[PDB]
Design a protein around this ligand. Structure first.
Ligand SMILES: O=P(O)(O)O[C@H]1[C@H](OP(=O)(O)O)[C@@H](OP(=O)(O)O)[C@H](OP(=O)(O)O)[C@@H](OP(=O)(O)O)[C@H]1OP(=O)(O)O
Ligand SMILES: O=P(O)(O)O[C@H]1[C@H](OP(=O)(O)O)[C@@H](OP(=O)(O)O)[C@H](OP(=O)(O)O)[C@@H](OP(=O)(O)O)[C@H]1OP(=O)(O)O
Ligand SMILES: [Cl-]
Ligand SMILES: [Cl-]
Lengths: 281, 281
């Protein structure tokens, strides 16, 4: 009964959250050995590996994965950098998701306003017919975590202070609720987040968060399945809203590589079954 | 005095316009031999080449250029497919152009509205505060020429009939004038195109086109230079408007790979000097 080496190249803070003793031991009990990748040596001098999982960015890290992928074509990489690239530009990302087909629920993409420079952020006429609150997000991101963050914006003044180029999306047809859907291979958890039309400094109104494992479950798996086929990613979460006008249409508003799976209890079982699948194809 | 082989992989219609006897003879008089690439054989069995120019798309054509670039690292390709990729998504394209710096003129990028689906094209509230006429353009293109075309749209009804995903840009601050700037290496020609706020069926008002080789010439070369450094393309034209509110700010609204250089008289001299530079680096 052979053993599988699962290499992992993660920042220390992501190691602390995701590589917990309970995951290491569960995986070792099933013949899978989680081995940290030395950031101080080339990847080519390390291993061998039966599977490689990472959350690092840079041209050096990318070169290594290209080298590695050429030297070792059979060894799965989670995820390949070419596939994480698809998230780099918010507008290209949502385009790749739009090329899905179709069920008693429909799923669409909300329209986006792209503002490239400071000047336009002042004097672009259309901005003055937007409804608040708005989701703002930098246009390009991969790397620094702040680029991955999506802001709720309550005032025109507060927009005027964001750093362009950014993407603007209306949030008013959502009923104040975002569904964050964690995916590993085939699914995991949904966080329901409720936001409000008034900020909190403006009026003392409340926001709330709950967890489950709320939109139809057969539909969420249909979506999650298509995102994975289209993006070629195995580890992502995706933000979605109900269009509460009809009340049966859903919209994908965001996608994030390798989110915080350790926040969900029982993540160790889900990720260990995933590693098992990946090293047996 | 050795001879340089300039291979060319062009569609027949593009061969008829661009590969004229006058260019073939001018280049042969200077020791450069224009050789057609056989579309019926692999590129790897043809040549050898000192320079390769093309306007073909597809995964087969791309494989060949990747093969070729690995076998022949010193041989310049005009242009490399990785660089033509930068034009594929209108929003990523304008992002790459936005990462230029800065002169008595400024240059910016107009804001864009991205509409991904039929539903949103009907019911997205912001569309109703846009000013007409609008430039509409498909979001993704490279390949079929219709995707490369940018439409002037005069009515809301006429928008309602476009195929999503598309990008919308306001055209009202331009004074009804677009400057098309042809670039080869370092510059070439400007077409001044004048469009109007009423379509022509609506009112019998006129549009006009003139040519020159109107914005400052030192500035046009500053822009053209930066586009080339940033996109890594040697053969493009770029559309630009004056913001006629101030009257000294210009905006880049579009970029097209390898346009119709043969429409400009004296193109043969410009392209032959270009081939000379390319085979001597
Ligand atoms: O800003 P980031 O470093 O990308 O961190 C985010 C962010 O955390 P902050 O509250 O510190 O900004 C999210 O919080 P929200 O702003 O979306 O509420 C959090 O989501 P949760 O609060 O729901 O834990 C998310 O975690 P996830 O990746 O699980 O979506 C986490 O991202 P990282 O922990 O991956 O960096
Ligand atoms: O639609 P495309 O095949 O991309 O053809 C276009 C288009 O021609 P149509 O008039 O047939 O649509 C342009 O015309 P406009 O619509 O912009 O007026 C023309 O520009 P000119 O009329 O100014 O010749 C342009 O040529 P260029 O590439 O020189 O910008 C030419 O593109 P191709 O000849 O490259 O296909
Ligand atoms: Cl985690
Ligand atoms: Cl031509």
């Amino acid at each position: 009964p052979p053993r599988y080496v699962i290499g992992y190249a993660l920042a220390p803070k992501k190691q602390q959250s995701f590589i917990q003793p309970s995951l290491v031991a569960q995986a070792a009990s099933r013949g899978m050995d989680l081995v940290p990748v030395d950031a101080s040596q080339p990847l080519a001098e390390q291993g061998p590996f039966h599977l490689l999982i990472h959350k690092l960015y840079g041209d050096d890290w990318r070169a290594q994965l290209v080298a590695f992928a050429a030297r070792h074509p059979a060894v799965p990489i989670v995820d390949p950098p070419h596939a994480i690239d698809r998230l780099h530009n918010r507008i290209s990302m949502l385009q790749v998701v739009s090329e899905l087909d179709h069920q008693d629920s429909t799923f669409g993409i909300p329209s986006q306003v792209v503002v490239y420079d400071a000047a336009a952020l002042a004097d672009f006429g259309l901005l003055a017919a937007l409804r608040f609150p708005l989701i703002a997000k930098p246009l390009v991101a991969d790397g620094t975590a702040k680029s991955h963050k999506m802001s709720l914006v309550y005032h025109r003044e507060g927009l005027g202070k964001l750093r362009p180029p950014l993407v603007l999306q209306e949030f008013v047809n959502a009923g104040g609720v975002i569904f964050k859907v964690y995916v590993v291979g085939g699914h995991v958890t949904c966080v329901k987040r409720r936001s409000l039309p008034d900020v909190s400094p403006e009026d003392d109104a409340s926001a709330q968060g709950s967890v489950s494992f709320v939109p139809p479950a057969a539909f969420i798996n249909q979506i999650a399945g298509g995102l994975r086929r289209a993006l070629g990613l195995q580890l992502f979460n995706f933000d979605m809203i109900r269009d509460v006008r009809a009340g049966d249409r859903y919209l994908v508003i965001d996608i994030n590589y390798f989110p915080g799976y350790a926040k969900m209890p029982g993540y160790e079982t889900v990720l260990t079954d995933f590693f098992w699948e990946m090293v047996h194809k």
